[PDB]
Amino acid sequence: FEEQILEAAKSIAAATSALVKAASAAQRELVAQGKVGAIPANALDDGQWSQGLISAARMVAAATNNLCEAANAAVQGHASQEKLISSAKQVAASTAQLLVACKVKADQDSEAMKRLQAAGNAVKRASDNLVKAAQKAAAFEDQENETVVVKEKMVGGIAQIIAAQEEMLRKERELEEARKKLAQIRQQQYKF
């Protein structure tokens, strides 16, 4: 249960250490070939690309550390299973950004490119493994109590369908507002 995700957590840690090493090597290649003028200055502290791709790798590591903490909270019963997939999606976005950033800024068949791509794919697949392990271990993986409910009264039944259908439209309003809030907080994240 908790030991299962811990093994996958250590797999996550090893894969992210591989990411750190590969990103450092790629940064060495970029500064050696003059692809980018790397500056050893921590702009906006870590930021996202202070001193280059190493900051992106570090932020990926922070995101996956948050993912591991979320998995631990779930296996302790304090985090919803939808927290795990949200943190995993953030980690996937981060590693995709790092991989694409290194992809266009380096040589076509650079060996460091291959190391970064393989290591990022490893982190992605191991993240899905950890997420599925935590969700299946979670007792709230599948649960529903809405199989069949009926009302004898003709008035009661139609009122029942109308209440459920209003619940439809209310949750759909929640769709709109929640997405708009997420979009606003993404725009405010850096605002260029």
Binding site: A56, K89, V104, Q108, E166, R173, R186, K191
Partner: protein, 373 residues
């Protein structure tokens, strides 16, 4: 292996979205936003604020429909963002922050349109990378060619782009606002001539369907008009959504004729054949033979029956008799642009052409003018 890229052809009329490597778009739906124009009485429904895409197409009776894209230029940015939502989360049902997105744009578009597209794609959806391609180049990619002049006629923009051996000739690029939507409006205007009155936006969609079902391009306009005026063979019937049956005669070929005689809608510009010929003549003399031999048509407005024959005849009448003129009109050209994008999104070399969000963060939205043609 690698994360597949998203290809989203944001046409004026239709949105075609899918994944790189596929041979057909996974989500093709109208790019409309509908808002209710009446009063909701029942409390259990009539409460959603705005409908997007096919949903609006199913509720046009009680909705005002607006296209956020007009003449290839995005005018309502909130509506366009809503449409991009409905594309990513409902139709494709993916997370844009893990897939690079390839977008398309007509040539000679305003710079602010492209900058706002980049800013929205990076700050609202947080895609890892993005790229804005020219629709004609993608259309050429779809046909497996490196040389040819592309006539792309969408819903809002009709543009000619000549390309020779992978090199574009920007000075020879021609653009014309005459497109499918203008044809629909002219069809409404000339359908009022038989007593059929279509006014509302829903009736505009009905007329667009009529245009897509019964209109065709006449090989010879004057002879076709004489035939329609003498015989009644050209007359064709169509059933309205309310059960009324309408019958249209010469209007079947007068509507597409605006493509070749833009003066029908009061525009001074020349027809598509003359624009193509002028674009060819603006190129270097040594490549005109290949451009003549590689006319590639794409876009929904080029799906009219018999349009290829008419274009061939007109350009033959314009070009010297020695040149060999070939109109390439693949049966799947309505998706050609998207298909081309898919190909471009699957190439290993193009993986170096992405605008990563690192460059966007360090250089701002202006970076899209240093990395995209």
């Amino acid at each position: 292996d690698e994360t597949t890229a998203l290809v989203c052809d944001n046409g004026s009329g239709l949105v075609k979205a899918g994944f790189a490597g596929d041979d057909a778009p996974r989500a093709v739906f109208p790019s409309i936003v509908g808002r209710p124009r009446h009063q909701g009485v029942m409390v259990g429904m009539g409460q959603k604020d705005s409908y997007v895409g096919d949903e609006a197409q199913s509720k046009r009776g009680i909705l005002t429909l607006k296209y956020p894209i007009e003449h290839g230029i995005i005018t309502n940015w909130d509506d366009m963002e809503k449409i991009w939502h409905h594309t990513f989360y409902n139709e494709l049902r993916v997370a844009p922050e893990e897939h690079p997105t390839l977008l398309t744009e007509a040539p000679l578009n305003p710079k602010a349109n492209r900058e706002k597209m980049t800013q929205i794609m990076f700050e609202t959806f947080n895609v890892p990378a993005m790229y804005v391609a020219i629709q004609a180049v993608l259309s050429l990619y779809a046909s497996g060619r490196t040389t040819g002049i592309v006539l792309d006629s969408g819903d809002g923009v009709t543009h000619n782009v000549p390309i020779y051996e992978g090199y574009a000739l920007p000075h020879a690029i021609m653009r014309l606002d005459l497109a499918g939507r203008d044809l629909t409006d002219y069809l409404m205007k000339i359908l009022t001539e038989r007593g059929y009155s279509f006014v509302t936006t829903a009736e505009r969609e009905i007329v667009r369907d009529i245009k897509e079902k019964l209109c065709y391009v006449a090989l010879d306009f004057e002879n076709e008009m004489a035939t329609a005026a003498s015989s009644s063979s050209l007359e064709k019937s169509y059933e309205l959504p309310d059960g009324q049956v309408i019958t249209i005669g010469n209007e079947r070929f007068r509507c597409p004729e605006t493509l070749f005689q833009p003066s029908f809608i009061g525009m001074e510009s020349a027809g598509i054949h003359e624009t193509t010929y002028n674009s060819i003549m603006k190129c270097d003399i040594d490549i005109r033979k290949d451009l003549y031999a590689n006319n590639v048509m794409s876009g929904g407005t080029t799906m009219y029956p018999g349009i290829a024959d008419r274009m061939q005849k007109e350009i033959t009448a314009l070009a010297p008799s020695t040149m060999k003129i070939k109109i390439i009109a693949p049966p799947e050209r309505k998706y050609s642009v998207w298909i081309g994008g898919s190909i471009l999104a699957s190439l290993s070399t193009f993986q170096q052409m992405w605008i990563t969000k690192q460059e966007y963060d360090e250089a701002g939205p202006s970076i899209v003018h240093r990395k995209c043609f």
